[PDB]
Paper text:
The phospho-MurNAc-pentapeptide moiety from this intermediate is then transferred to the lipid carrier undecaprenyl phosphate (C55P) at the inner face of the cytoplasmic membrane by the essential integral membrane enzyme [name], generating the penultimate PG precursor, lipid I. The peripheral membrane enzyme MurG then transfers GlcNAc from UDP-GlcNAc to lipid I, forming lipid II, which contains the basic monomeric unit of PG. [name] is a polytopic membrane protein with ten transmembrane helices. The structure of the enzyme from Aquifex aeolicus revealed that it forms a dimer with most of the monomer–monomer contacts made between the N- and C-terminal helices. Our characterization of this and other related [name] variants supports a model in which [name] is feedback inhibited by the accumulation of flipped lipid II, limiting the synthesis of PG precursors when their supply exceeds the synthetic capacity of PG synthases.
The cryogenic electron microscopy (cryo-EM) structure of the YES complex containing wild-type EcMraY was recently reported, and this methodology was used to obtain the structure of EcMraY([name]) within the same complex. Focused refinement of [name] alone in the EcMraY([name]) complex substantially improved the potential lipid density at the [name] dimer interface. As in previous A. aeolicus and E. boltae [name] structures, this electron density fills the hydrophobic cavity found at the [name] dimer interface. However, we uniquely observed this electron density extending into the periplasmic space above the [name] molecules where the environment is more hydrophilic. Although structural refinement could not conclusively identify the lipid within the dimer, the size of the electron density extending into the periplasmic space is consistent with a large head-group such as the disaccharide-pentapeptide found on lipid II. Notably, the T23 residue lies near the dimer interface on the extracytoplasmic side of [name]. We conclude that the [name] substitution generates a hyperactive [name], leading to elevated lipid II production in cells. Consistent with this possibility, tyrosine at position 21 has an altered conformation in the [name]([name]) structure in which its hydroxyl group forms a hydrogen bond network with Y227 and K358 on the opposing monomer. Substitutions within these residues were also identified in the screen for hyperactive [name] enzymes, and Y227 is in the periplasmic helix that was found to be altered in the MD analysis upon lipid II binding. Although this result may be affected by the enzyme being stuck in an inhibited state by the phage inhibitor, it suggests that [name] and other changes in [name] may affect the conformational response of the enzyme to lipid II binding rather than the binding event itself.
Author numbering:
A (entry chain E): 1 to 58, 64 to 121, 129 to 360
B (entry chain A): 1 to 56, 64 to 125, 129 to 360
Amino acid sequence: MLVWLAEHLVKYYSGFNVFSYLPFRAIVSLLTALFISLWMGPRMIAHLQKLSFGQVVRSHFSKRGTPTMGGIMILTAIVISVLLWAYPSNPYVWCVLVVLVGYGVIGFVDDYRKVVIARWKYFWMSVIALGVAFALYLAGKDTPATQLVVPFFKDVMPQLGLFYILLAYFVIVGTGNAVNLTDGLDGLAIMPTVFVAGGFALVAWATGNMNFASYLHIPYLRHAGELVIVCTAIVGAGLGFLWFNTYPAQVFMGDVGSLALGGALGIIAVLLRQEFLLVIMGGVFVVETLSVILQVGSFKLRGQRIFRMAPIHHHYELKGWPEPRVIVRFWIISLMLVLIGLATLKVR
Amino acid sequence: MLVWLAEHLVKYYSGFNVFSYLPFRAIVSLLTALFISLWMGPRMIAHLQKLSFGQVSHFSKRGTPTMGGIMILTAIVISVLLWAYPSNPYVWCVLVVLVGYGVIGFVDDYRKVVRKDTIARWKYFWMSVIALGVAFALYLAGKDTPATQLVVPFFKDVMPQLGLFYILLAYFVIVGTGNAVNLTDGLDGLAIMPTVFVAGGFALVAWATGNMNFASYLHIPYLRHAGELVIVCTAIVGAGLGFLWFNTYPAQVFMGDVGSLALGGALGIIAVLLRQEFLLVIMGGVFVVETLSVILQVGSFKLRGQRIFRMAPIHHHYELKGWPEPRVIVRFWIISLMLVLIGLATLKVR
C-alpha cells in the first residue's frame, strides 16, 4: 500500500516515480523484510522465552530451553513487507498472503496447544488449499495460466481441468509437510527456503515481461510480475530469521513459521505453473519426504530399517556427522538444485 | 579445451553447438569443478593428514590439515582449462595470478607446517612483482581504451581514464584483496562462502559486460573476450562450494595461505579485468571491514595503547565476546550475501 502513496504523491515531486520500478521495489522489499525481522528480534525471543519458561535469563552447543514460536517473526516480516511494497490490487499477492496467514495460524495454534491434533491440522490445510485452487481455477478458464509446464519440453503443455486443482492441492500440502519435517534441525528449513524463494523471484520476473516470457516459453501471467516482491520479501525474511536460527539456534523455527513458509513456496510454485521447478529447486524437502516414506514403508514391510532415522538429516546426524556440518552440506545441496532448476527453464 | 574438441568434431557430432553457448558451458563448468572437488576431497585430506602429522573428540582442534587449498586451486584450474577458451588473454591472466598466489601460499605453508618453522616478506615481494607484471601487461593491452577507464557507480557521467595510475590501482586492489582474504580465514568456512557469493556476482557482471547491447543498457565498459571470465568466476563458485563441503564448522580440512591467497588474488584480478574495483569493495565489504578493523585496532594499540576490540579480526572479536563459531560464520555469510545483492543493485542505478 505504501507504493500507492508514492504514485499518488508523485505529482508534487516527480522523483517518486522510481518506486514503481520492479527491481528497486524488490530490493527495498528485501531490505525492509530483513530490517523488520532484526528489529523484532531479541525483544521477540525474550517475550517468547518469558512466556514459555518464565526465567528470561539464559552450554551453547548443548542448547536447552530455547523458544519454539519464532515463526511469527517470519510471518510479520513477510506480511509487512508485502503489504508495504506490493500492489494490494493484485489478486495473486493476496492469494499468497492468505495462504501464508492460514498456514501460519494453523501452526501457531498447533504450537500453542503443544506448549499448553493431526486430523485438525490436515483438514484445515486441505480445505484452505482446495479453496485457493478452486478460486485460481475459476479465474484461469482455458488459459495458459492453468497449463501444466514440464522442463525439457515446449511442444507439450497439457491443459488441466480438475487435475489443476488436484495438483495444486498436492503441491501445496506436500511442500508444507516437507518443510514441517525438514524443521528437524535448526536452520535447515530456512536457507533452502531462501534459495528457492530467490529462484522463484527470478522465475516470476521472467514471467512478467513479454519479451522474456516469449523467449523462455514460460506461460504468461499478467499479474505474476508482482510476485517478485513477495518472493524477495520471503528471501529477506528468511535471511533475517536465519540470523538467529543458526546451529546455536537462539529461537527454534517451530511449525508456526515452517508451515507458512512451505505453503508460501508451494503457492508461488502453483501460481507460476512451476510445480516441477519447485520439486527440482526444493529437492531437499522432496528427498526428505521420500526418505521418511521409505523408512516407514520398510519398517512396516519388514523388520530391517533403511536409515537410522526417517529423515535424512537425522540419519546423518546420528551417523556421526555434527549438526552444523550436515546443515551446511544440505545448504550446498539446496543451492546446487536451485541453480539446476533455473537452468532447466533455459534448456527448454 | 573441450570446446575446441566440440568445434572440430561437430562435423559428425551434429548438434554440439550447445557446447559453445555461454550459459550452458558456465553451468557445466560449475558442475565439473564441484564434482571434481567432491571426488578428490577425501584423498587429499587423507594424504595431508598422513603428511602434516605423519599419522591418520567431536570438535577437536587438532588433526585438521592446514594447507588444503590445493583442492580449490586444482579444481579451478582444471575446470577453466577444460571449459574456457585458452585463446583469450583474460582467462590466462586470471589463471596465472591464481596459480602464482597458490604456489606462494603453498610454499609458505610447507615452510610453516612441514618444517615446523614460524617465507618472510619474500611472499610480499613475489605478490608485488606478479601484480605489477600483470598490471603492466594489461596496460600494454589497453592504450587509451575503455578497458582502463575507471568505473564509478551511481554516476555514469564521470569515468576518469587512468594512465600510470592503472598499475597502482591494480596493485592496491589485488594485494589488498589477497591480504584481506588471508586475514578473514581465521575461522573455518568464513573465507569461502563469501568468496562464492562475490564470484557469482562477478560472473553475472562479466556476462553483462560481454554483450554490446546489455553493456550499453547498463552503461558498463564493453570488454571484448571478457565473457569467458564468466567461466572462471563460475568455476570459482563451484570450487569454493565444493571446498565448503569439507570446510564447515567441523572443519575436516583447514585452508591455509594456499587457496586463501589464491582466491583473494582471483577476486582482485577479476575485479581489475572487469574494471569494477569499487564494486569489488562493495561485494567484499566483509573482507574490507575485517582488514580495516585489524588496522584500526593496531593503530589504537600503537598510539593510545588501549584496545577497543578483543582481537584484531572482527570475527575473533565477536566469538571471544560470547558468540559461538557457527553463529559468527553464518552471520557473516548473510552479511556477505546481502552486500553482494547491494552491489549488484548498485550496478543498475547510475
